[PDB]
Design a protein around this nucleic acid. Sequence first.
DNA 1: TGCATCCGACAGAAAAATTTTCCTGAATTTTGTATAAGTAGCTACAAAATTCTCGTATTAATGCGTTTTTTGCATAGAGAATATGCGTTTTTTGCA
Length: 156
Amino acid sequence: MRLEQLQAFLAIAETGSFQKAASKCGVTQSTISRQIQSLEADLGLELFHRTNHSKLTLGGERLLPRARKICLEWETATQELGDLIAGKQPELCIAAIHSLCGSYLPPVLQKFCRDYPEVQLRVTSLGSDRALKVLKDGLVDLAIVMNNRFLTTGRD
DNA sequence: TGCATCCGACAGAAAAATTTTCCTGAATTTTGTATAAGTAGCTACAAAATTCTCGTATTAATGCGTTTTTTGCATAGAGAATATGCGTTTTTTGCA
């Protein structure tokens, strides 16, 4: 089921000479045909045209459900670790408190704008006992509450 | 013509009568005899097929020396953690 035999023999299943698997998938006639000769038995259905000529017998067009769906997951990964940020491109959630959400740092908004202008942002609540809970985990993606709490997370 | 009274054992002999059984037509538990038609199969024949075999051709299979690669390897930093630490703090003692 693995990638090379998956993607190789299947898109084979609509073409061969395994020269078709070597292309698109990558597995050459070497590790494809040899491993697929024994694999032709492991899911339990003849995929290509057993050394014949042109066929779609029981390839992977009907095996990808229990097959491709998986490696489509890492196919999204095969694309890239995202485009902006590796994980959760939008990750800038500010604290909800009654002190300083509004007005003390407009040159920081300047630099954020200078490095990246009008960039969408988000928010969470913390508490300050609950800020503690969710910052020693680091929930509050950006977090500000009396430093006398929330102590754990990474880097001590 | 009106007042009482009463009723609704036994024996012999010949004829009949129920079954039984062999003879005699009647036309069945049925089943018997030959001839000619006809119904169904056997011998023969058709061949171009189709398909079995030997040879050649491409192709797919299978092994390897090597590409890069994934995963196990080590030793370098950091970020508090952990003392001293006073220095500050909480503990512990006697008088009214």
